[PDB]
Enzyme design. Structure first.
Site, short mmCIF file in Angstrom:
data_model
loop_
_atom_site.label_atom_id
_atom_site.label_comp_id
_atom_site.label_asym_id
_atom_site.label_seq_id
_atom_site.Cartn_x
_atom_site.Cartn_y
_atom_site.Cartn_z
N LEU A 48 0.98 -0.95 -0.54
CA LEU A 48 -0.10 0.04 0.28
C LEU A 48 0.46 1.02 -0.26
O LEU A 48 1.86 1.49 0.87
CB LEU A 48 -0.90 0.09 1.46
CG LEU A 48 -0.28 0.14 2.69
CD1 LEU A 48 -1.52 1.25 3.50
CD2 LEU A 48 0.18 -0.54 3.28
N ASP A 49 0.64 2.62 -0.80
CA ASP A 49 1.05 3.70 -1.18
C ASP A 49 0.80 4.35 0.66
O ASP A 49 0.49 3.94 1.08
CB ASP A 49 0.25 4.14 -1.95
CG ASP A 49 1.08 3.14 -2.98
OD1 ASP A 49 1.71 3.05 -3.03
OD2 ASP A 49 0.00 3.38 -4.47
N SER A 50 1.56 5.48 0.26
CA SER A 50 1.31 6.68 1.33
C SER A 50 -0.36 6.96 1.85
O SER A 50 -0.25 6.63 2.97
CB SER A 50 2.17 7.80 1.34
OG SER A 50 1.72 8.35 -0.44
#
Lengths: 176, 60, 55, 68, 459, 171, 111, 59, 119, 87, 128, 157
Positions: J41-43
């Site tokens: 998952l990203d930021s």
């Protein structure tokens, strides 16, 4: 205006605008499911232009985002009843005596609570014993004359405590 | 000697003493005066406390 | 911690709903009439409060 | 094992001052109350007769309360 | 009354021929015996004023102020230790004897026969207080404070002497009944205007009025506690008593000449209530509060109503007690922290918890607590000034609102909301502090029960 | 009792109840219970105290005063003459204050007895109230506070001189 | 009537005892809320009676005593009355605030 | 019940003691707007019938 | 009703106005129309201290209503027939005042418009 | 007005509300795991995790602190710092 | 899509749209770093003179004492009487004072004439 | 125990010396030190500030004083006594400010306008006066028990 750096890492400014827009849309939208719809639409609108490799185009979209956000904001955001400006904002602050006190009690009551006061005395031993050489030498040795930061290093030397521990550890329970 | 001989004792001392500015005495005097004046028919408190027969005005 | 299993609060709310359903009519009935009640209204002048609250 | 250590600024000087204050007003408050009680239950206030002619009284014996 | 004068003389060498750790007990015990002696005084009845001697006399307006002075003395001598207790015994005896001599001149001042004697005892009221505040001012500009003090009071009070010699040499003797019983309406010349302006101007300096007000706050912020409480209470209400005495003369021209004094009084009351709402240095707030209340007093004096006089003397006694209390509050916080600033020292809701009720009651009495003597006095003042003018109520009510506001802000600034978590030295509440508090606020509310004493000569 | 002739007190008009109910009558039952509880020991303790009053005899008198000559008989200086005249006039001022106090509580008692009937049975007491306050406003009112006796004499002279010239130039 | 005035004055004077009772104790009442609740309930049940006597009768009265500063041509005392508004307005406020005393017993438990 | 006994029987005794004697030896004191008398009733103190109202009709 | 709309939009002429109500003098179209019964005993009306602005017509119903309310008080739901009689009598008086308004309205309108059309 | 808490219980509750989320697998979800590195998952989704647990626990954490969580162990530690979880 | 948020003496400009945080100079970032260095050194010596268990009393802030002596004692020096100071002094010292002066004389003359005639409410006007 | 050099004698001239002294003494930047200037308004050489300090300085910075918003290192604000929280809320406005004043003045002006419109043109049910039976309720007025029996009667319609 931040503890660690001086700039604030533009990605983080975008992320701040993300959190504040999402919070103001929480305040805007009841029923939670049309809210979920609107939040996913906003999240998709942010993901429409995620991989722009420029910077001037990014900050132009940021300026226009700030304009549309300040136009479409809400007067009373749903701020939590622990948040600053909220409902509580240290509601039960009434019993927050910092524990530099309680040594100025009468010795009858100090005879009433023997265990806590003897253990306070051994914490006081622990405070005094590690205070002079290790703490002052780590503060005067590893930083430059311009300290250039707000974080303090751990006492990774051999033994005892990293400095400045007293007021940080011995602060009250935040709910009496 | 700040309270236990001064405060409550002085408060009971000044809590009763004779009527300052002749107060109840003036009450009883006013009662006698109004009773006398109504019993002798004349209206109470005629004006001109100084006697209008006891005057010599500068004539015009 | 949704907990109203509480004798004090059910006593207080119980007794105030008792005082909130009888005492209005009871108090409003036993007053000396210190003024003239009107009692003669046209159409949509006595009904108007109920009409506006329903709409 | 569940109760928390309660925190207070100080209590003993407060209670000492208030105890000394209430007792030292209590020490010569109650005999004065009992004295004025025995006065207005035994010796009475006065009666309200008139001046007899051919008699001059004191500059006391004009006042209602006996201790006055 | 010389039976009250001469034991105060006898108490003067008492401190000298008292040994160590015995000055305190002798002075305090015998001055409280003088307090019983002072409460014995009120024999005064009805129409005239009582005469005590070939020399002098007690009016019904002199008696509560003499009671206030001889009641404020033991409270003050109880107050002014522990900030000079580390210094020498000979200097301590000097200080105690100087206060007792100061009291003796004050009693001679309040119980004066003639206004010449009142003038002698007026500047005798002035002089040793300046020695006290200059020797123990404990702040670097006490020099300039005392210099301003003596120059303003002796400069304003100078033509009063010549006007009194003129009233002597044109109207016979100066004793108050034969000064009274003989007066004539003196017409609209200029000499009446200048003589009236000289006497009233001397007392304008003594109140102070607004245009000569800065005399007062430096002499409060740069004085120790004894000189400050004596200064405010006894000196300013002594000036008010002096004007209340002398104002029997020159009534036909004061209607023509008394407008701009009322003007500067009212507008400076407004501006002084405005200035003591924003300032730090908490000690100055009591001083500008006193300027506000004595401007209100001056409005009440130059209107010449019995309602006004009774309300004015009630306001005098009430604000004297209030300002001496609030000076003691400031000294309590100063003994806690050696700051004298206002925004620094905060908290104290937890710490010293019952002192908060005393700070509450102090802001209540400066707030005009609704059965207090302060409110009763200001109420009769407002009633009398609205009878004098149907238009004056804007400035009076604005004084009321802003007075409430700065008294409340004075409460909630230093003792509301949050400890500053760097004080970390202060001790709990002493016995002496709340002892002085109980000595202040019990007689105030016990006068608030039965105020039959504390109204004017036309009670 | 007291002086019920300088203090006007009209008699009372109490009707007789007649229920017409079977609740029955909580106020009569309640006041009999209150009497049988409270009224007897108050009466007995009062009788004990009144016998203790009956054991001893105190009295107090009315300090009556003589009559001064005048102030208009005093000459220009006459200090002991003036002293007597001034203090007797000041006592006249104080007893006139208490006259106004008695008439004011008379008006209070008339307003409280008659209740909703305002002008009925109180118009004449209101009339004599306005009469005596007309006398007071004309005589003692507008002179100030630093009086001794002399200013009232000056206002008296000025008022009767103005009235003399007014009726002579209007007659 | 001695009853009507005396019962109004005791509905007043019941509202003084906890003040002196905490000021002269120094070893404070643990059941102080129970104490205050039952004396306010006593105040309500004593204030029931003169209202019933009022609306049964009328009899609208003033009581006044202890005149202080009876100085000038006016005079004033501690003086209050019962007409209709001040008559029957009292038990409503007492009963409401008694219920608020219950809710403040519960609502301020852990403080 | 002993709570109610002391707390609303001692001040009742004191106030009923004070509100006879001192309060009526002060003459101008507690006073009452009279209960209303009606034209078809009888007086409990003195006693005489008041004339009622006359014919009502056309209701 | 339409009286207010006509009085504020059309003419205020033929509509009579409050606090200046008696405009025509009496017995113009009365003939022999006054009874004003009023045997409500003015002196006994003073003797029974009614509220002011009630010492009026239909007062005897209020007298009997207060009489039964007094003499059977804890019968809480007793007096309602006399209560309705008093309400009905004030209904009569209110209808009579409306009759006064509309009588002045009809007189003013008809005679003023007749004489100001042909005079 | 006294909610009890425990470190293992609140650890299991935070692990449970992480396991409720969609795009990370419920199989491989560690107590001690990164966010940007391994979970995929990203930021942005990480700050959505932050927002949801703020909304559940009733107190926010700031963006000046939202830079530096990166792992659930420090999340449990910081929320335990806010709640002061001992008897 | 907005009137661009005008600033004013009450309208506090929020830190979102500055818009001076768009064309940031490198020397302005250097100024921010110097600001961080100043706050770093000051909080460092605060934590030096603050956490000492050997220390007993107050923190002895020099800046607050600096502000107080600037606010109280540093008023009269420095000063020169300029045009603005003298004009504003005449406006706040004399203006409203003479305003209340003329309105008090005016209302007093109205009262004086109305009681000189005698048509006042002195039917009873006791408490003067 | 304080140095006279830690006060602020004289204004900003000269530009080497006083600017160096201000930047070393106030612990400030050189150019962010902003004199007023010396305009005869007292003020010494005290720095100009952006003057907001309340809803700026966001509370998650976690500075030293939790309510006074200090950090123990500042010059100070000159009107800091007028700019604490619980004194003046210097918040950003949610819309504008002239927008606020013009909408509020227009609304209150319209309400007072329609108040005057109501006050000149009232409403009523159309009903004549009240029939007070006894000479329009005479002798329960101010009195005159036999002075003026005033002829006024009611006539049935």
């Amino acid at each position: 205006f931040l503890p660690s750096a001086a700039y604030l890492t533009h990605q983080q400014k975008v992320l701040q605008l993300y959190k504040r827009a999402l919070r103001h849309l929480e305040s805007r939208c009841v029923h939670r499911d049309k809210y979920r719809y609107f939040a996913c639409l906003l999240r998709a609108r942010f993901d429409e232009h995620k991989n722009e490799k420029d910077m001037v185009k990014a900050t132009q979209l940021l300026r226009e985002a700030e304009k549309e956000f300040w136009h479409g904001q809400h007067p009373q955001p749903y701020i939590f009843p622990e948040s600053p400006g909220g409902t509580s904002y240290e509601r039960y602050e009434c019993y927050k005596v910092p524990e530099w006190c309680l040594d100025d009690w009468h010795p009858s009551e100090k005879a009433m609570y023997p265990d806590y006061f003897a253990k306070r005395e051994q914490w006081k031993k622990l405070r005094r014993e590690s205070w002079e050489r290790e703490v002052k030498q780590l503060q005067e040795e590893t930083p430059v004359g311009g300290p250039r930061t707000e974080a303090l290093p751990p006492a990774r030397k051999q033994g005892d405590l990293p400095p400045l521990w007293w007021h940080i550890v011995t602060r009250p329970r935040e709910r009496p | 000697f700040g309270f236990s001989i001064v405060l409550v004792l002085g408060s009971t001392f000044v809590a009763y003493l004779p009527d300052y500015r002749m107060q109840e005495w003036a009450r009883r005097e006013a009662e006698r005066l109004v009773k006398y004046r109504e019993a002798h028919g004349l209206p109470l408190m005629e004006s001109n406390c100084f006697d209008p027969s006891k005057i010599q005005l500068p004539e015009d | 911690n949704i907990n109203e299993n509480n004798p004090f609060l059910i006593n207080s709310i119980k007794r105030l709903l008792i005082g909130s359903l009888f005492a209005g009519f009871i108090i409003s009935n036993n007053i000396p009439p210190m003024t003239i009640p009107q009692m003669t209204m046209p159409h949509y002048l006595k009904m108007t409060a109920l009409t506006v609250t329903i709409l | 094992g569940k109760r928390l250590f309660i925190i207070k600024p100080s209590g003993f000087y407060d209670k000492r001052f208030l105890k000394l204050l209430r007792f030292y007003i209590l020490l010569t408050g109650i005999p004065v109350v009992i004295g004025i009680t025995l006065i207005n239950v035994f010796i009475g206030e006065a009666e309200l007769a008139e001046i007899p002619e051919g008699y001059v009284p004191e500059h006391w014996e004009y006042f209602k309360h006996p201790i006055s | 009354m010389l039976k009250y004068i001469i034991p105060t003389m006898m108490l003067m060498p008492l401190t000298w021929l008292s040994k160590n750790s015995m000055i305190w007990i002798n002075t305090t015990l015998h001055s409280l015996l003088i307090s019983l002696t002072s409460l014995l005084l009120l024999n005064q009845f009805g129409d005239n004023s009582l005469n005590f001697s070939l020399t002098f006399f007690s009016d019904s307006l002199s008696t509560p102020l003499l009671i206030l002075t001889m009641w404020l003395l033991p409270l003050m001598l109880m107050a002014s230790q522990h900030h000079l207790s580390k210094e020498n015994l000979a200097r301590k005896k000097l200080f105690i004897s100087m206060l007792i001599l100061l009291q003796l001149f004050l009693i001679m001042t309040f119980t004066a026969t003639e206004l010449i004697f009142f003038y002698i005892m007026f500047e005798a009221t002035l002089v040793p207080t300046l020695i006290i505040i200059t020797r123990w001012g404990n702040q670097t500009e006490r020099l300039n404070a005392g210099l301003y003090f003596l120059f303003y009071t002796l400069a304003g009070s100078l033509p009063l002497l010549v006007a009194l010699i003129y009233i002597q040499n044109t109207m016979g003797s100066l004793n108050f009944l034969i000064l009274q019983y003989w007066v004539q309406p003196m017409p609209n010349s200029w000499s009446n205007t200048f003589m009236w302006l000289a006497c009233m101007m001397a007392f304008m300096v003594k109140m102070p009025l607004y245009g000569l007000h800065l005399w007062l706050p430096k002499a409060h912020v740069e004085a120790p506690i004894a000189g400050s409480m004596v200064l405010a209470a006894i000196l300013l209400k002594l000036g008010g008593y002096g004007m209340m005495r002398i104002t029997l003369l020159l009534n036909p021209i004061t209607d023509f000449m008394a407008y701009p004094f009322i003007m500067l009084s009212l507008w400076g009351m407004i501006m002084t209530s405005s200035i003591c709402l924003r300032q730090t240095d908490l000690k100055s707030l009591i001083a500008y509060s006193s300027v506000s209340h004595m401007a209100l007093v001056i409005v009440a004096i130059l209107i010449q109503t019995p309602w006004s006089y009774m309300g004015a003397t009630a306001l005098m006694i009430a604000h004297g007690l209030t300002s001496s209390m609030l000076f003691c509050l400031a000294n309590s916080n100063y003994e806690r922290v050696h700051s004298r600033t206002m925004i620094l020292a905060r908290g104290l809701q937890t710490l010293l918890p019952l002192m908060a009720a005393w700070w509450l009651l102090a802001s209540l009495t400066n707030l005009a607590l609704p059965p207090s003597i302060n409110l009763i006095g200001e109420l009769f003042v407002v009633m009398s000034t609205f009878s004098w003018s149907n238009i004056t109520i804007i400035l009076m009510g604005l004084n009321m609102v802003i007075t409430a506001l700065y008294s409340l802000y004075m409460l909630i600034t230093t003792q509301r909301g949050k400890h500053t978590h760097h004080i970390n030295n202060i001790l709990p509440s002493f016995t002496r502090e709340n002892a002085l508090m109980s000595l202040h606020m019990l007689p105030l509310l016990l006068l608030s029960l039965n105020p039959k004493i504390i109204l004017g000569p036309l009670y | 009792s007291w002086d019920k002739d300088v203090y006007p007190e009209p008699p009372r008009r109490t009707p007789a109840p007649s229920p017409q109910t079977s609740l029955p009558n909580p106020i009569t039952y309640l006041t009999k219970a209150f009497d049988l509880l409270v009224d007897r020991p108050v009466t007995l303790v009062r009788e004990f105290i009144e016998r203790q009053h009956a054991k001893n005899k105190y009295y107090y008198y009315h300090r009556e005063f003589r009559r001064v000559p005048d102030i208009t008989e005093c000459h220009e200086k006459d200090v002991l003459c003036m002293f007597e005249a001034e203090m007797q006039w000041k006592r006249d001022y104080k007893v006139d204050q208490e006259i106004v106090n008695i008439i004011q509580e008379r008006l209070k008692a008339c307003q409280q007895r008659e209740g909703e009937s305002h002008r009925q049975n109180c118009a004449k007491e209101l009339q004599q109230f306005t009469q005596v306050v007309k006398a007071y406003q004309d005589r003692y009112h507008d002179l100030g506070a630093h009086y001794s006796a002399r200013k009232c004499l000056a206002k008296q002279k000025q008022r009767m001189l103005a009235e003399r010239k007014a009726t002579k130039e209007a007659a | 009537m001695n009853l009507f005035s005396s019962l109004t004055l005791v509905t007043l004077i019941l509202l003084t005892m906890p003040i002196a009772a905490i000021n002269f104790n120094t070893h404070k009442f643990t059941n102080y809320p129970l104490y205050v609740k039952t004396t306010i309930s006593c105040a309500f049940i004593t204030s029931m009676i003169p209202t019933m006597m009022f609306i049964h009768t009328g009899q609208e009265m003033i009581i006044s005593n202890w005149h202080w500063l009876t100085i000038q041509t006016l005079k004033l005392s501690l003086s209050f009355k019962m007409d209709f508004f001040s008559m029957m307005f009292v038990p409503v406020a007492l009963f409401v605030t008694w219920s608020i005393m219950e809710f403040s017993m519960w609502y301020m438990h852990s403080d | 019940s002993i709570f109610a006994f002391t707390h609303v029987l001692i001040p009742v005794w004191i106030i009923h003691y004070y509100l006879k004697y001192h309060v009526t030896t002060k003459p101008y004191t507690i006073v009452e707007k009279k209960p209303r008398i009606f034209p078809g009733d009888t007086i409990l103190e003195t006693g005489e019938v008041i004339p009622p109202m006359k014919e009502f009709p056309d209701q | 009703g339409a009286h207010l709309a006509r009085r504020y939009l059309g003419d205020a002429s033929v509509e009579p106005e409050p606090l200046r109500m008696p405009t025509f003098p009496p017995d113009y179209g009365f003939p022999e129309r006054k009874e004003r019964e009023m045997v409500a005993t003015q002196q006994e009306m003073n003797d029974a201290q009614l509220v002011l602005q009630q010492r009026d017509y239909c007062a005897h119903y209020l007298i009997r209503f207060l009489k039964c309310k007094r003499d059977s008080f804890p019968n809480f739901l007793a007096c309602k027939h006399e209560q309705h009689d008093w309400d009905y009598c004030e209904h009569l008086d209110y209808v009579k005042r409306m009759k006064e308004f509309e009588r002045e309205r009809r007189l003013l309108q008809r005679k003023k418009r007749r004489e100001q059309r042909e005079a | 007005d006294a909610p009890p808490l425990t470190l293992e219980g609140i650890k299991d509750r935070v692990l449970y509300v992480l396991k409720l989320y969609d795009k990370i697998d419920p199989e491989k979800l560690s107590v001690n795991s990164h966010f940007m590195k391994d979970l995929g998952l990203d930021s942005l989704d990480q700050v959505e995790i932050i927002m949801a647990m703020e909304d559940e626990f009733g107190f926010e954490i700031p963006d000046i602190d939202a830079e530096k969580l990166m792992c659930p162990q420090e999340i449990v530690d910081y929320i335990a710092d806010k709640k002061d979880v001992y008897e | 899509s907005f009137p661009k948020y005008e600033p004013s003496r009450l309208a506090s400009l929020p830190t979102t749209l500055d818009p001076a945080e768009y064309d940031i100079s490198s020397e302005t970032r250097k100024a921010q770093a110097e600001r961080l260095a100043i706050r770093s050194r000051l909080k460092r010596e605060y934590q030096l003179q603050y956490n000492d268990p050997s220390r007993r009393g107050v923190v002895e802030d020099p800046a607050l004492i600096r502000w107080t002596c600037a606010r109280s004692a540093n008023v009269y020096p420095n000063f020169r009487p300029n045009t603005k100071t003298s004009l504003l002094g005449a406006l706040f010292g004399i203006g409203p004072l003479i305003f209340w002066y003329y309105v008090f004389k005016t209302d007093r003359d109205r009262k004086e004439k109305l009681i000189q005639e005698g048509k006042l409410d002195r039917t009873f006007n006791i408490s003067y | 125990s304080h140095i006279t050099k830690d006060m602020l004698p004289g204004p900003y001239p000269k530009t080497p010396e006083e600017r160096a002294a201000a930047a070393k003494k106030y612990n400030m930047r050189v150019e962010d030190y902003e004199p007023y200037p010396d305009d005869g308004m007292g003020y010494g050489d005290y720095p100009k500030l952006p003057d907001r300090s309340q809803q700026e300085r966001d509370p998650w910075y976690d500075w030293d004083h939790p309510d006074l918003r200090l950090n123990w290192g500042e010059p100070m604000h000159w009107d800091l006594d007028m700019y604490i929280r619980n004194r003046v809320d210097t918040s950003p406005t949610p819309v504008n400010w002239n927008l606020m004043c013009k909408h509020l003045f227009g609304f209150v002006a319209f309400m007072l306008f329609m108040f005057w419109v109501g006050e000149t043109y009232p409403t009523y049910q159309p009903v004549g006066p009240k029939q007070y039976p006894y000479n329009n309720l005479y002798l329960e007025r101010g009195g005159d028990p036999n002075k003026e029996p005033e002829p006024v009667v009611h006539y049935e319609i």
